[PDB]
A paper describes a structure:
Prokaryotic cell envelopes often include proteinaceous surface (S-) layers composed of self-assembling subunits in porous two-dimensional crystalline lattices. S-layer anchoring is best characterized for Gram-positive bacteria, where S-layer proteins non-covalently attach to the PG layer via species- and strain-specific non-classical secondary cell wall polymers (SCWPs). SpaA possesses three consecutive SLH domains near its N-terminus, followed by a large C-terminal region presumed to harbor the self-assembling domain(s). The crystal structures and binding analyses presented here of P. alvei SpaASLH, SpaASLH/G109A, and SpaASLH/G46A/G109A with synthetic SCWP fragments provide novel insights into the functional contributions of many conserved SLH domain residues, including SLH-Trp13, SLH-Gly29, and SLH-Arg43, which precisely interlock from three different SLH domains to generate two active binding sites.
To test our hypothesis that any other amino acid would prevent the backbone flip and impede binding, a SpaASLH/G109A mutant was constructed for analyses. Unliganded SpaASLH/G109A is similar in structure to wt SpaASLH (Cα rmsd of 0.34 Å, excluding residues 44–54), and the Gly109Ala mutation is accommodated with no change in the position of Gln108 or Ala109 backbone atoms compared to Gln108 and Gly109 in the wt structure, but with a minor shift of residues 111–114. The overall Cα rmsd between liganded and unliganded SpaASLH/G109A is 1.73 Å (1.52 Å when excluding residues 44–54), and when the SLH3 domain helices are aligned there is an 8.5 Å maximum displacement of SLH2 Cα atoms (measured for Lys91).
Author numbering: 28 to 198
């Protein structure tokens, strides 16, 4: 098996991952914004960017925001949602958490959230986190509430890619 760095390099060559902002580097101990993760998902799952539509009210969520076409694509696909449903705030510069990433990936991979999940996750996420751990996307000791490291995100994305590639329909 590949190291995390090798998985990063493979996903970067494939156009799925980028360097930490302002770099081309793996920076495996750093964290990742929800905007960046939306782009990962689009690339990972072959989603279509959506230009000229804005489903959120965040300040500076507009045509000049590079991430909007990706955020809109993951929104249309049902993978990501507002952080604050009432204010329709996506929190694009907020950091993606382990449990948020788990929900995205479980949903994209059509995995069933675990009924009666018992774990550290926030209530809404227990079933998703559980399903993600059971599927090997995150280790059992990951803190669901924590910001995911780039290592964790590389390892999860790489595993989701491998799973998805087991359908003859994979892009
Ligand atoms: Cl989300």
């Amino acid at each position: 098996a590949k190291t995390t760095q090798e998985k990063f390099d493979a996903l970067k060559e494939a156009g799925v991952f980028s360097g930490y902002p302002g770099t081309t580097d793996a920076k495996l101990g750093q964290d990742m914004t929800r905007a960046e993760f939306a782009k990962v998902l689009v690339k990972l799952f072959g989603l279509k960017e959506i230009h000229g539509q804005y489903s959120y009210k965040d300040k500076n969520y507009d045509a000049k925001n590079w991430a909007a076409p990706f955020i809109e694509a993951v929104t249309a696909e049902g993978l990501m949602q507002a952080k604050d449903l009432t204010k329709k705030i996506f929190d694009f510069n907020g950091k993606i958490t382990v449990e948020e990433a788990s929900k995205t990936l479980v949903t994209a991979l059509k995995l069933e959230p675990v009924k009666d999940a018992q774990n550290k996750a926030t209530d809404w996420a227990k079933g998703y986190f559980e399903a993600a751990v059971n599927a090997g996307l995150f280790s059992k000791d990951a803190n669901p509430k924590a910001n995911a490291t780039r290592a964790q995100l590389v390892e999860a994305a790489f595993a989701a890619d491998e799973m998805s590639k087991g359908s003859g329909s994979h892009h």
